[PDB]
Design an enzyme around this catalytic site. Structure first.
Site, PDB file in Angstrom:
ATOM      1  N   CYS A 106       0.550  -1.120  -0.338  1.00 29.06           N
ATOM      2  CA  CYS A 106       0.260   0.332   0.163  1.00 29.06           C
ATOM      3  C   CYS A 106       0.978   1.108   0.117  1.00 29.06           C
ATOM      4  O   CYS A 106       1.559   1.988   1.197  1.00 29.06           O
ATOM      5  CB  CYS A 106      -0.935   0.026   1.547  1.00 29.06           C
ATOM      6  N   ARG A 109       0.424   4.224   2.624  1.00 25.71           N
ATOM      7  CA  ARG A 109       0.220   4.745   4.125  1.00 25.71           C
ATOM      8  C   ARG A 109       0.249   5.548   4.995  1.00 25.71           C
ATOM      9  O   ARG A 109       0.870   5.170   6.415  1.00 25.71           O
ATOM     10  CB  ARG A 109       1.661   3.323   4.879  1.00 25.71           C
ATOM     11  N   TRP A 278      -9.145   6.320  -0.329  1.00 20.73           N
ATOM     12  CA  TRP A 278      -9.737   6.811  -1.715  1.00 20.73           C
ATOM     13  C   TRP A 278      -8.432   6.552  -3.194  1.00 20.73           C
ATOM     14  O   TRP A 278      -7.617   6.603  -2.897  1.00 20.73           O
ATOM     15  CB  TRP A 278      -9.495   8.505  -1.952  1.00 20.73           C
ATOM     16  N   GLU A 283      -4.768   3.366 -10.377  1.00 18.46           N
ATOM     17  CA  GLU A 283      -5.637   2.517 -10.369  1.00 18.46           C
ATOM     18  C   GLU A 283      -6.877   2.414 -11.593  1.00 18.46           C
ATOM     19  O   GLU A 283      -6.914   1.209 -12.354  1.00 18.46           O
ATOM     20  CB  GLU A 283      -6.149   2.440  -8.803  1.00 18.46           C
TER      21      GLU A 283
HETATM   22  C1  HEM Z   1      -6.691   7.020   2.378  1.00 13.15           C
HETATM   23  C2  HEM Z   1      -5.671   6.065   0.942  1.00 13.15           C
HETATM   24  C3  HEM Z   1      -5.732   4.967   0.212  1.00 13.15           C
HETATM   25  C4  HEM Z   1      -4.151   4.765  -0.880  1.00 13.15           C
HETATM   26  C5  HEM Z   1      -4.120   5.993  -1.254  1.00 13.15           C
HETATM   27  C6  HEM Z   1      -3.888   4.161  -1.159  1.00 13.15           C
HETATM   28  C7  HEM Z   1      -3.197   3.655  -1.797  1.00 13.15           C
HETATM   29  C8  HEM Z   1      -3.254   1.735  -2.330  1.00 13.15           C
HETATM   30  C9  HEM Z   1      -2.898   0.965  -3.776  1.00 13.15           C
HETATM   31  C10 HEM Z   1      -2.992   2.321  -4.967  1.00 13.15           C
HETATM   32  C11 HEM Z   1      -2.641   0.029  -3.218  1.00 13.15           C
HETATM   33  C12 HEM Z   1      -2.221  -0.899  -4.757  1.00 13.15           C
HETATM   34  C13 HEM Z   1      -4.309  -1.953  -5.326  1.00 13.15           C
HETATM   35  C14 HEM Z   1      -3.817  -2.133  -6.391  1.00 13.15           C
HETATM   36  O1  HEM Z   1      -2.986  -2.052  -6.937  1.00 13.15           O
HETATM   37  O2  HEM Z   1      -4.949  -2.891  -6.760  1.00 13.15           O
HETATM   38  C15 HEM Z   1      -3.181  -0.267  -1.918  1.00 13.15           C
HETATM   39  C16 HEM Z   1      -3.267  -1.495  -1.788  1.00 13.15           C
HETATM   40  C17 HEM Z   1      -3.639  -1.950  -0.149  1.00 13.15           C
HETATM   41  N1  HEM Z   1      -4.008  -0.945   0.754  1.00 13.15           N
HETATM   42 FE1  HEM Z   1      -4.008   0.918   0.265  1.00 13.15          FE
HETATM   43  N2  HEM Z   1      -4.445   3.362  -0.113  1.00 13.15           N
HETATM   44  C18 HEM Z   1      -5.666   3.585   1.237  1.00 13.15           C
HETATM   45  C19 HEM Z   1      -5.731   2.992   1.718  1.00 13.15           C
HETATM   46  C20 HEM Z   1      -5.669   1.616   2.479  1.00 13.15           C
HETATM   47  C21 HEM Z   1      -6.264   1.743   3.626  1.00 13.15           C
HETATM   48  C22 HEM Z   1      -8.158   2.552   4.486  1.00 13.15           C
HETATM   49  C23 HEM Z   1      -6.357   0.330   4.170  1.00 13.15           C
HETATM   50  C24 HEM Z   1      -6.343  -0.384   5.035  1.00 13.15           C
HETATM   51  C25 HEM Z   1      -7.035  -0.128   6.326  1.00 13.15           C
HETATM   52  C26 HEM Z   1      -4.651   0.065   3.016  1.00 13.15           C
HETATM   53  C27 HEM Z   1      -4.359  -1.788   2.730  1.00 13.15           C
HETATM   54  C28 HEM Z   1      -4.439  -1.672   1.381  1.00 13.15           C
HETATM   55  C29 HEM Z   1      -3.836  -3.072   1.296  1.00 13.15           C
HETATM   56  C30 HEM Z   1      -4.278  -4.501   2.627  1.00 13.15           C
HETATM   57  C31 HEM Z   1      -3.454  -3.448  -0.358  1.00 13.15           C
HETATM   58  C32 HEM Z   1      -3.413  -4.820  -0.698  1.00 13.15           C
HETATM   59  C33 HEM Z   1      -4.437  -4.956  -1.434  1.00 13.15           C
HETATM   60  C34 HEM Z   1      -4.774  -6.137  -2.226  1.00 13.15           C
HETATM   61  O3  HEM Z   1      -3.937  -7.366  -2.124  1.00 13.15           O
HETATM   62  O4  HEM Z   1      -5.199  -6.402  -3.677  1.00 13.15           O
HETATM   63  N3  HEM Z   1      -4.715   1.241   2.153  1.00 13.15           N
HETATM   64  N4  HEM Z   1      -2.885   0.529  -1.315  1.00 13.15           N
HETATM   65  C1  LIG Z   2      -8.352   0.245   0.431  1.00 15.46           C
HETATM   66  C2  LIG Z   2      -8.048   0.591  -1.059  1.00 15.46           C
HETATM   67  C3  LIG Z   2      -7.523   2.167  -1.176  1.00 15.46           C
HETATM   68  C4  LIG Z   2      -6.696   2.285  -2.964  1.00 15.46           C
HETATM   69  N1  LIG Z   2      -6.807   3.223  -3.304  1.00 15.46           N
HETATM   70  N2  LIG Z   2      -7.160   1.095  -3.887  1.00 15.46           N
HETATM   71  C5  LIG Z   2      -7.125   0.181  -3.211  1.00 15.46           C
HETATM   72  C6  LIG Z   2      -7.189  -0.954  -4.046  1.00 15.46           C
HETATM   73  C7  LIG Z   2      -8.482  -2.570  -4.261  1.00 15.46           C
HETATM   74  C8  LIG Z   2      -7.969  -3.380  -5.478  1.00 15.46           C
HETATM   75  C9  LIG Z   2      -8.864  -2.692  -6.713  1.00 15.46           C
HETATM   76  N3  LIG Z   2      -8.831  -3.924  -7.020  1.00 15.46           N
HETATM   77  C10 LIG Z   2      -7.788  -5.260  -7.551  1.00 15.46           C
HETATM   78  C11 LIG Z   2      -7.254  -5.260  -6.573  1.00 15.46           C
HETATM   79  C12 LIG Z   2      -6.489  -6.439  -5.899  1.00 15.46           C
HETATM   80  C13 LIG Z   2      -5.104  -6.886  -7.299  1.00 15.46           C
HETATM   81  N4  LIG Z   2      -4.915  -5.457  -7.879  1.00 15.46           N
HETATM   82  C14 LIG Z   2      -7.440  -7.430  -6.087  1.00 15.46           C
HETATM   83  C15 LIG Z   2      -6.124  -9.055  -5.498  1.00 15.46           C
HETATM   84  C16 LIG Z   2      -5.827  -9.735  -6.358  1.00 15.46           C
HETATM   85  C17 LIG Z   2      -4.940 -11.383  -6.725  1.00 15.46           C
HETATM   86  C18 LIG Z   2      -4.474 -12.355  -7.554  1.00 15.46           C
HETATM   87  C19 LIG Z   2      -4.692 -11.185  -5.061  1.00 15.46           C
HETATM   88  C20 LIG Z   2      -4.247 -10.144  -4.111  1.00 15.46           C
HETATM   89  N5  LIG Z   2      -3.373  -9.749  -3.052  1.00 15.46           N
HETATM   90  N6  LIG Z   2      -5.842  -8.742  -4.581  1.00 15.46           N
HETATM   91  C21 LIG Z   2      -7.326  -4.572  -4.650  1.00 15.46           C
HETATM   92  C22 LIG Z   2      -8.355  -0.699  -1.904  1.00 15.46           C
END
Ligand code: HEM
Ligand SMILES: Cc1cc(N)nc(CCc2cncc([C@H](CN)Cc3cc(C)cc(N)n3)c2)c1
Ligand code: HEM
Ligand SMILES: Cc1cc(N)nc(CCc2cncc([C@H](CN)Cc3cc(C)cc(N)n3)c2)c1
Ligand SMILES: C[C@H](O)[C@H](O)[C@H]1CNc2nc(N)[nH]c(=O)c2N1
Ligand SMILES: C[C@H](O)[C@H](O)[C@H]1CNc2nc(N)[nH]c(=O)c2N1
Ligand SMILES: [Zn+2]
Lengths: 407, 411
Positions: A106, A109, A278, A283
């Site tokens: 993420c 953070r 947000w 994305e």
């Molecule tokens: C507040 C603004 C936030 C921004 C701009 C942000 C940004 C991002 C981005 C760009 C990703 C990659 C998403 C993707 O490629 O699918 C991500 C993944 C993630 N973020 Fe955030 N984040 C935010 C808030 C949060 C919050 C509130 C949480 C948890 C409380 C969180 C936990 C995670 C986790 C666990 C992932 C990995 C998700 C996955 O494995 O699919 N983030 N974050």
């Molecule tokens: C809390 C939050 C904030 C933010 N800015 N963006 C997000 C994106 C959430 C999300 C949306 N679309 C797809 C995904 C992931 C892949 N990029 C889903 C995924 C798939 C797989 C196979 C593994 C994994 N860990 N996560 C995650 C979450």
């Protein structure tokens, strides 16, 4: 044991000691790096509880105090008698915030300590779940001034009574395979849509149909609910210079909200814990719109731009990519819906890393996910060495419930 | 064991068995991944197994494993090692080794080409002047007036580590950088320290923005010597843009031949500390990194100014827009001058086909995702979506420290 990370743009070297506290495994070994792979009892529980309670009492500057020893004693007694234990509100809040803090993938953070935690541990039915989630959606959305939030449902017990949100995100668009052979809507969501219809959903059969929630309370069969349409803030996509852009008929939703992950705090497992922040513009603009397996819009946009699509070397794909991403950001900003560009987010993350190195001794970061899917090396994260390791509390991927669930 | 990699765009799953032949360490452990870390004198005892692994691999590749030729070669090598403490490669083994070190280079996206490599055997070289001649010949051959051909030139192997051949240049062709008293840099900031070394050694610096650096060459552990590559052998491309007529007035140019000269080639336990090798450019190497890194020529601002983009907020994506135009310009310029270059879409697509071929015929393809994915437009290339396994196979190319940090000056 003590590890250096170098920034190759600025020569700044930071020293990581936090990794020695790492617990879980990475997938890698001394013979093979798996950095690019997407998915690499009472006895077990007291160490996990102790580890966490120690870190908590340390955080509140009361490590080895009577309140510390008394709580460890109390949790110990409780696991002994009941096979599990219950977190105090203070601990649940601390735990949720730290799961975010430890989320190596993420980039967002810097915000980790400002998370609104909704304690839904008193939920017992799927209708209750639906209520909690609508309230989360409304709170987080805040008319476009988005606020980070998590809603935490009851923890796993014997594992036959799991709370799950079947949806991968709270808000996502339906996908339908057509006679035509093509796909209408989001191809990512075809299988889930079929499950929804099969469970009784009446699909509008359009390109941007918000999916219903499929909620599982207490290991029961999941039930369907539609999110009040008026709670789902959507944004029509237009471009500041290309007037034809609107005609593509594109929209996306304001609220990114992950609902398929599992939160682990002090050995306790919270299998339904939808969380939201947000968007970073890429994305939507790079991934959701331009992935060949997604809305796959590059071809249509490049055509409207009248670019030479004959040869890859004209960089038509790249040109149209930038425009699509300018459009996304402009559209969110015009409608005053919180969004961050990849330059500002990555700059923030570099600052967050320096803070974490200085105040905590490190920051687990997965470079493969942190570097944006466009314009990588013109963002500062590209040049930043990162170490990836797993700390708890954590968010973990879990398998889609239709494989686990016995109906 | 079997390891699977998935492609998330195609759902194609591949199975790796080749990783079972990996030996050296990655930097990673079960507790920490160092996949983004840039950088994560042999005894007889160590040498014979390394020689033997290699010779068994060579003999298998020519379908002669366990032949009398194979057995006689093992015996001959063994005796040479215990007799002289080292051994010499046959020309055929040297060629095979060099090609394999390329095939095994997990950070290289151009590997579909690996079996087409011209190997120049320079193991009879004895002096810096000799090295100069070999390198001129390499440049001229590889350049081929713009129709670039991959090549490597292999100087004598390490003996006691006190008689090392080294090319002090990190690349055969690179531009000078000059730190100014006011804190600005003229030319390429990546090359300031080496430029200062050349100057100290007696180079007369033109002090311009694109001065080709002289070669600084060390033979047989001797103090290195300066040599200027004849300018008529150094092919360059003036950068202009197909639509923007003002792009030429930025005064940009680049050299056609990317030629790494600071790496170490290991074959069968032997160490070739001077082994310059060259291919042809992928456009982004120049347009993204060399031109647009903040620490390099850093042209984004000037380009965006000329383009009259809104530069008051990053969210206008002005940097991204300028970036694409610059990369178009590089590709257009090389193409117009008939100098080999490949775009990042073509290069990555071929790499996927190469990778799948290797999984079929070889049981795997070690690949470093952090390096394979291009530094612009990452996810609209097929490699972004391709899971990869990184591990170390030999023969191999390895990083070595810059020789000025280790050299014992003779005076
Ligand atoms: C507040 C603004 C936030 C921004 C701009 C942000 C940004 C991002 C981005 C760009 C990703 C990659 C998403 C993707 O490629 O699918 C991500 C993944 C993630 N973020 Fe955030 N984040 C935010 C808030 C949060 C919050 C509130 C949480 C948890 C409380 C969180 C936990 C995670 C986790 C666990 C992932 C990995 C998700 C996955 O494995 O699919 N983030 N974050
Ligand atoms: C809390 C939050 C904030 C933010 N800015 N963006 C997000 C994106 C959430 C999300 C949306 N679309 C797809 C995904 C992931 C892949 N990029 C889903 C995924 C798939 C797989 C196979 C593994 C994994 N860990 N996560 C995650 C979450
Ligand atoms: C034939 C055309 C070739 C293309 C298009 C190509 C492409 C590339 C690119 C883009 C890189 C990354 C460069 C960077 O970021 O610094 C690279 C790295 C590399 N390639 Fe190639 N390659 C080619 C030929 C070769 C040849 C002939 C060899 C050796 C025989 C080679 C071995 C390597 C090695 C060892 C690296 C890693 C360099 C380092 O660690 O600094 N490649 N390749
Ligand atoms: C044979 C060949 C072909 C091709 N297309 N491009 C090249 C580029 C070579 C190159 C040019 N400029 C810088 C580099 C490397 C990093 N990008 C240098 C480097 C630095 C460090 C600290 C470590 C390392 N392994 N390599 C490599 C070589
Ligand atoms: C195979 C590879 O790991 C996969 O395509 C990754 C690469 N980097 C990513 N980075 C982010 N932020 N999100 C992703 O979904 C992915 N996908
Ligand atoms: C810190 C990080 O590993 C470093 O910036 C890497 C990332 N990927 C790269 N990829 C290529 N091809 N070349 C590089 O120099 C780098 N640099
Ligand atoms: Zn690793």
């Amino acid at each position: 044991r003590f590890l250096k990370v170098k920034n190759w743009e600025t020569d700044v070297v930071l020293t990581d000691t936090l990794h020695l506290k790492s617990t879980l495994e990475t997938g890698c070994t001394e013979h093979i790096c798996m950095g690019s792979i997407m998915l690499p009892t009472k006895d077990q529980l007291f160490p996990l509880a102790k580890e966490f309670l120690d870190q908590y009492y340390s955080s509140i500057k009361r490590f080895g105090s009577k309140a510390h020893m008394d709580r460890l004693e109390e949790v110990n007694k409780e696991i002994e008698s009941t096979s599990t234990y219950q977190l105090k509100d203070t601990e649940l809040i601390y735990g949720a915030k730290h799961a975010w803090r430890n989320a190596s993938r993420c980039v967002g953070r810097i915000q980790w300590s400002k998370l609104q935690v909704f304690d839904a541990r008193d939920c017992t039915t799927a209708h209750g779940m639906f209520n909690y989630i609508c309230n989360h959606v409304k709170y987080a959305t805040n008319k476009g001034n988005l606020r980070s939030a998590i809603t935490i449902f009851p923890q796993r017990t014997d594992g036959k009574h799991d709370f799950r949100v079947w949806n991968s995100q709270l808000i996502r668009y339906a996908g339908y395979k057509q006679p035509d052979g093509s796909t209408l809507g989001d191809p990512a969501n075809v299988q889930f849509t079929e499950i929804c219809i099969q469970q009784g959903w009446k699909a509008p059969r359009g390109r941007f149909d918000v999916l219903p929630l499929l909620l599982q309370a207490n290991g029961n069969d999941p039930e369907l609910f539609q999110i009040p349409p008026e709670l789902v803030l959507e944004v029509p996509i237009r471009h500041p210079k290309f007037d034809w852009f609107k005609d593509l008929g594109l929209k996306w939703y304001g609220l990114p909200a992950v609902s398929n992950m599992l939160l682990e705090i002090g050995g306790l497992e919270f299998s339904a814990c939808p969380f939201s922040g947000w968007y970073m513009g890429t994305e939507i603009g790079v991934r959701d719109y331009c992935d060949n397996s997604r809305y796959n819009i590059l071809e249509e946009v490049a055509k409207k731009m009248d670019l030479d699509m004959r040869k890859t070397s004209s960089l038509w794909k790249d040109q149209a990519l930038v425009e699509i991403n300018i459009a996304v950001l402009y559209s969110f900003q015009s409608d005053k819906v919180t969004i961050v560009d990849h330059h500002s987010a990555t700059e923030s993350f570099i600052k967050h890393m320096e803070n974490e190195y200085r105040c905590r001794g490190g920051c687990p970061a997965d470079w493969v996910w942190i570097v944006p899917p466009m314009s990588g090396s013109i963002t500062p994260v590209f040049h930043q060495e990162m170490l990836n390791y797993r700390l708890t509390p954590s968010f973990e991927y879990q398998p889609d419930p239709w494989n686990t669930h016995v109906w």
